[PDB]
């Protein structure tokens, strides 16, 4: 597809999440890069509102 020519190199990634779990509101910001040639993603996420009210692993499929 034409869209795939966009992915032949390393692409910077930004992730921004706003969450509310049982009324616990929080935000997460992430940065990193992806290299689809190798199926490879590297990302670092920060909870910008303080402590994350849920375990980090439970957010991997949403943020990663």
């Amino acid at each position: 597809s034409k869209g795939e020519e966009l992915f032949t190199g390393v692409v910077p990634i930004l992730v921004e999440l706003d969450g509310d779990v049982n009324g616990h509101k929080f935000s997460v910001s992430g940065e990193g890069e992806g290299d689809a040639t190798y199926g490879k993603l590297t990302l670092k996420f920060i909870c910008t509102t303080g402590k994350l009210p849920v375990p980090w692993p439970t957010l991997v499929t949403t943020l990663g």
């Binding site: 869209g3 969450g19 689809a36 849920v54 957010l59």
Partner: protein, 165 residues
Amino acid sequence: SGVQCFSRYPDHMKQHDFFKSAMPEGYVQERTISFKDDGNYKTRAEVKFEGDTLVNRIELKGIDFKEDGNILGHKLEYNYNSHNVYITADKQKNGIKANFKIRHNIEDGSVQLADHYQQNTPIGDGPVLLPDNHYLSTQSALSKDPNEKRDHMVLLEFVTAAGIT
């Protein structure tokens, strides 16, 4: 799981890559994540290019969690098991659906299942690839930045499409 456009599609399967085909205008990704014997997440994300940057913007809503369950009680290990994401076409919406199971390790040695149901629909008006059934093989590693004192996660993930000859 959030930017499945970074999956490696083997050359012989590239006609099945919805995710890249929707770029740069992007796609909406929605999920219901059902934690067995606990609450659920509903997520809505827009994944698209902003200039040369791939952006994933997400709203997450969680309800019905148990105060002392594995999620709000923080009883899950900081690790992650390999899994497959099973994809099928959704022609009625010119997109795709996916289903898969995440097994989160509980600190007592048990497992917390998180059933995932997923739908993706294109944002733009360019043509998109509607795939035959296949899956994404995913491996993920979680770590900490030893100089980071904020609450954080470092993720390394590898994703490869498979399931077609």
